[PDB]
């Protein structure tokens, strides 16, 4: 999300 590049930010 900040380093786990999550989808649909
Ligand atoms: Cu991340
Ligand atoms: N997001």
Phi, psi of 3 (to 5 degrees): -150, -5
Residues in Cβ contact with 1 at an 8 Å cutoff, skipping those fewer than 6 apart: 9
Q: What is the CA(9)–ligand 2 centre distance, in A?
A: 2
Q: How determined?
A: NMR
What span, in angstroms and rounded, lies between the C-alpha atoms of 5 and 2? 6
Rg (C-alpha) for the chain, rounded Å, is 5
Indicate the SS3 state at residue 3: coil
Q: What is the CA(6)–ligand 1 centre distance, in A?
A: 6
Atom 1 of ligand 2, residue of closest alpha carbon: 9
Read off the DSSP letter of residue 5: -
Is the CB of 7 inside a 6 Å radius of any atom of ligand 2? no
* Number of neighbours of residue 3 by Cβ within 10 angstroms: 5
């Amino acid at each position: 999300c900040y380093i786990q590049n999550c989808p649909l930010g």
